[PDB]
C-alpha cells in the first residue's frame, strides 16, 4: 500500500515537471498578437426564416452536407428533417423513445441518428425508403443516457454516453467496436475532426480529452475549467479547440502548443454556455447562453462582435453550415431560427 | 422543376396533417416524472406507465438504470406538470438524504416552476416503529422536542398521539423546506399513504388539476 503511495507521488512529481514544462513552451500570450490586427468591431445578423412546427422544446440540431437540409430533434418524439431553402418539411419521423437528446446527419445524406435517454441510439434510413420510414438499426449496449452522436463515415458512428464510456460503433453488427474509457463523470458532447482520425470529448470532469480513432487511448488531456464542459466544437484543420463551459468561460485550447491559449470571461455574464460551434474563419466564435440570447464573439480579439437576440427561452443548440451561408439556433421554445 | 415543388407541397400538407394529429395527442397526455428513494414503495404507487382517470391519461415516466447522478438529465424534465415524490416515512436513516434532495429539487434553476407532489409511503410501518418505541426521533433529529401536534391534524381513531406527533413532524419538516423559497408559483402538496390502498391515482388526478388551475390563474395575474 506504501508502494502505491510512492506510485502516486511519482505521478505527482512527474506531472509537476510536465505542467512546469508546458509553461516553459509558452512565454508570450495571445494578447501580444492582437495589436496589429484589424478588428471587426460591430457585426449583426437579420433573422431570415423561422422553421416552426415543433410541439415541445428543441434539444439539438444538425446541419446537412449540402447546407440545405437540417435535422431537428424535438422532445415530444418527433424527429423532423427540414429543407432550409424553401422553409419546408421533408420528413417527419415519429420515435419510440420520446426523450431524444442529440441527432446527426450522414455525409452521404442517406441516414440519420437519434441519441436517446432510453439508452438506445437508433439509426434511420431515409433515401432508400421514401415511403414508410422505419427504424433501420438499433445500437443497444450503453447503460447510461447517450448524449452526443455523429457519423464518422456512413458505416461508423461515434456515440458518447453518460456512463463515461464514449464508444465508437459499427452499424452492421450492432456491437461496441472501440471503447475510449478513462473519464469519471458525465460526458456531454463530441465534435468530429476533418480527417476523421481524431475527436475531442468534454465531460463533467472539467476536462477535455483528445482521442485517436484507431488505437483507442487518450492522447491528450486538457483542463482548466471550474465546472462542466457543456459543448465543444473545433477548428476546420484540427489544431485548435473551442470549449464552452458552465462557468461562462469560453476557452480556446491548442494542440501544437498544448496549453490553454485563450480564456474569455466578462462581468455582465453569469449565465452558463449551452453550445459553441464556430465559423469557417478563425475569427467568429458563436456561443449560446442561458440569458436566452446568442453572443457572437471574435476569437483572437476578445471583443463583442455582436448579439443575436430574439429567442423566448434558453438556446439549446447551434449550427454553422459547411459553406458558411447561414447560422441556425434552436432554443427551448420549439422555434428554430436561421441567421444570415 | 416546379412540379417536384408541387409534390413537395403536397407532402408538406400531409406532414402538417401528421403534426396536427400528434399535437392533439401530445396536448392530451400529462407527463409526470416520478423519482424517489429506492425501496420506498415506488412502483406500487398507482419506465413509462400510463393510467387513465376521467378520460385523462397520465404518462408517469419513472427513471431507472441511469447512474447515481442528476443535474444533466434532470434538466430534461422541465415541461412536466408535476413531480411525484415517494419517500419512506418509517426508515429514519434516509430522511436526511430525502430532505437534501427535495431541497435541491425545489431550488434548481430550471425546475423552479415545476411543483412537486409528495407521497409519504410505508405509513403503518412508521406507526409500528413508533408504537414499539425502539428508536427515537431524537437519536437522529434533535429538533423533535420543541414540537407538538398541529390543530389541523386529523388523528386516526385507535392511534397514539405519539403517532400523530411523529408523522406530522415529518410532514412539517418537508413543508418547512418548501416555504423558504416558494414564491406562490409552485407548491408542495403532501399526502400520507401506505402500500395497501389503490385510491392514489384519484389523488394525483385532483392535484394535477389544482396545478393546472393555478397555472392558468397566474397568467391573468388574478392570483
Amino acid at each position: 500500500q506504501s508502494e502505491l503511495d510512492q506510485l502516486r507521488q511519482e505521478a505527482e512529481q512527474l506531472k509537476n515537471q510536465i505542467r512546469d514544462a508546458r509553461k516553459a513552451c509558452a512565454d508570450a500570450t495571445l494578447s501580444q498578437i492582437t495589436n496589429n490586427i484589424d478588428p471587426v468591431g460591430r457585426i449583426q445578423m437579420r433573422t431570415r426564416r423561422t422553421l416552426r412546427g415543433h410541439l415541445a422544446k428543441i434539444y439539438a440540431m444538425h446541419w446537412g452536407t449540402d447546407s440545405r437540409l437540417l435535422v431537428s430533434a424535438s422532445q415530444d418524439g418527433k424527429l423532423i428533417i427540414w429543407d432550409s431553402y424553401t422553409t419546408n418539411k421533408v420528413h417527419a419521423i415519429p420515435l419510440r423513445s420520446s426523450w431524444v437528446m442529440t441527432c446527426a446527419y450522414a455525409p452521404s445524406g442517406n441516414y440519420v441518428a437519434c441519441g436517446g435517454l432510453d439508452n438506445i441510439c437508433s439509426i434511420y434510413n431515409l433515401k432508400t425508403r421514401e415511403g414508410n420510414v422505419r427504424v433501420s438499426r438499433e445500437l443497444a449496449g450503453h447503460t447510461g443516457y447517450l448524449s452526443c452522436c455523429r457519423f464518422l463515415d456512413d458505416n461508423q458512428i461515434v456515440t458518447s454516453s453518460g456512463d463515461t464510456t464514449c464508444a465508437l460503433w459499427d452499424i452492421e453488427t450492432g456491437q461496441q467496436t472501440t471503447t475510449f474509457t478513462g473519464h469519471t463523470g458525465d460526458v456531454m458532447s463530441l465534435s468530429l475532426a476533418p480527417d476523421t482520425r481524431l475527436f475531442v470529448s468534454g465531460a463533467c470532469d472539467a476536462s477535455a480529452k483528445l482521442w485517436d480513432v484507431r488505437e483507442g487511448m487518450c492522447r491528450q488531456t486538457f483542463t482548466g475549467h471550474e465546472s462542466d464542459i457543456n459543448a465543444i466544437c473545433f477548428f476546420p484543420n484540427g489544431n485548435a479547440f473551442a470549449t464552452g463551459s458552465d462557468d461562462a468561460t469560453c476557452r480556446l485550447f491548442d494542440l501544437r502548443a498544448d496549453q490553454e491559449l485563450m480564456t474569455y470571461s466578462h462581468d455582465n455574464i453569469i449565465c452558463g454556455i449551452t453550445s459553441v460551434s464556430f465559423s469557417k474563419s478563425g475569427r467568429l466564435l458563436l456561443a449560446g447562453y442561458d440569458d436566452f440570447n446568442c453572443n457572437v464573439w471574435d476569437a483572437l480579439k476578445a471583443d463583442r462582435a455582436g448579439v443575436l437576440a430574439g429567442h423566448d427561452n434558453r438556446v439549446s443548440c447551434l449550427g454553422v453550415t459547411d459553406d458558411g451561408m447561414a447560422v441556425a439556433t434552436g432554443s427551448w421554445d420549439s422555434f428554430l431560427k436561421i441567421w444570415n | 422543376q416546379r412540379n417536384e415543388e408541387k409534390a413537395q407541397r403536397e407532402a408538406n400538407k400531409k406532414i402538417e396533417k401528421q403534426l396536427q394529429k400528434d399535437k392533439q395527442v401530445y396536448r392530451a397526455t400529462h407527463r409526470l416524472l416520478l423519482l424517489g428513494a429506492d425501496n420506498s414503495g415506488k412502483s406500487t404507487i398507482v419506465f413509462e406507465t400510463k393510467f387513465q382517470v376521467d378520460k385523462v391519461n397520465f404518462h408517469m415516466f419513472d427513471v431507472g438504470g441511469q447512474r447515481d447522478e442528476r443535474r444533466k438529465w434532470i434538466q430534461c424534465f422541465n415541461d412536466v406538470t408535476a413531480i411525484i415524490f415517494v419517500v419512506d416515512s418509517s426508515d429514519y436513516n434516509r430522511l436526511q438524504e430525502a430532505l437534501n434532495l427535495f431541497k435541491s429539487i425545489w431550488n434548481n434553476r430550471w425546475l423552479r416552476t415545476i411543483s412537486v407532489i409528495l407521497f409519504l409511503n410505508k405509513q403503518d410501518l412508521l406507526a409500528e416503529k413508533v408504537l414499539a418505541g425502539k428508536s427515537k426521533i431524537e437519536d437522529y433529529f434533535p429538533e423533535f422536542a420543541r414540537y407538538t401536534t398541529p390543530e389541523d391534524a386529523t388523528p386516526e381513531p385507535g392511534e397514539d398521539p405519539r403517532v400523530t406527533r411523529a408523522k406530522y413532524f415529518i410532514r412539517d419538516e418537508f413543508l418547512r423546506i418548501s416555504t423558504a423559497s416558494g414564491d406562490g408559483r409552485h407548491y408542495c402538496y403532501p399526502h400520507f399513504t401506505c402500500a395497501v390502498d389503490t385510491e392514489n391515482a384519484r389523488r394525483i388526478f385532483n392535484d394535477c388539476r389544482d396545478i393546472i388551475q393555478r397555472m392558468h390563474l397566474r397568467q391573468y395575474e388574478l392570483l
Partner: nanobody, 128 residues
Framework: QVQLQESGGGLVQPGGSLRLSCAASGFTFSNYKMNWVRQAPGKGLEWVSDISQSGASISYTGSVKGRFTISRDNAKNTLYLQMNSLKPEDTAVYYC?????????????????????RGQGTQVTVSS
C-alpha cells in the same frame, strides 16, 4: 486545474476536539456553496454540514447538530470544521465537497458514487 487537499485527522479520544481544514485551489472560491460530507465504513455516503457563499446560511444535519460548527475563509480559500464531543460512530473519512455550479442554491455532490470536485480527504478515528 481544480485541486482540493485536506488536513487534520488521526485518533482522538471521545470527548476530544478537532479542527478539519480544507484547502482548495484552481478556481474562484467565494461565489458558490460548500458541503462537508463524511464516509462511514459499511455504509454509503452521508452528508454532514452546509455553508453558503458568504457564511449567511449554515445548517448542520443529523446527529451532529450543535456539537460541531463550520465556517469558511474566502480570501484564504479554506473551509473550517471545528468538532467537539466526538463519538465511536463518527469514525469516518471526511471529504470537503463542492457545489457543481456557481451562483446556485442547489447542490448534488454528497450521494455520488464518484464525483469530480471533492478531495481524497482525511480520516478521523476514536480510541476505545
Amino acid at each position: 486545474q481544480v485541486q482540493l487537499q485536506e488536513s487534520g485527522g488521526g485518533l482522538v479520544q471521545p470527548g476530544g476536539s478537532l479542527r478539519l481544514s480544507c484547502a482548495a485551489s484552481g478556481f474562484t472560491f467565494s461565489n458558490y456553496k460548500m458541503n462537508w460530507v463524511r464516509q462511514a465504513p459499511g455504509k454509503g455516503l452521508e452528508w454532514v454540514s452546509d455553508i453558503s457563499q458568504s457564511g449567511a446560511s449554515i445548517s448542520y444535519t443529523g446527529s451532529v447538530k450543535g456539537r460541531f460548527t463550520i465556517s469558511r475563509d474566502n480570501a484564504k480559500n479554506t473551509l473550517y470544521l471545528q468538532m467537539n464531543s466526538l463519538k465511536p460512530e463518527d469514525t469516518a473519512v471526511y471529504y470537503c465537497a463542492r457545489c457543481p455550479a456557481p451562483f446556485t442554491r442547489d447542490c448534488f455532490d454528497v450521494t455520488s458514487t464518484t464525483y469530480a470536485y471533492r478531495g481524497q480527504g482525511t480520516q478521523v478515528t476514536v480510541s476505545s
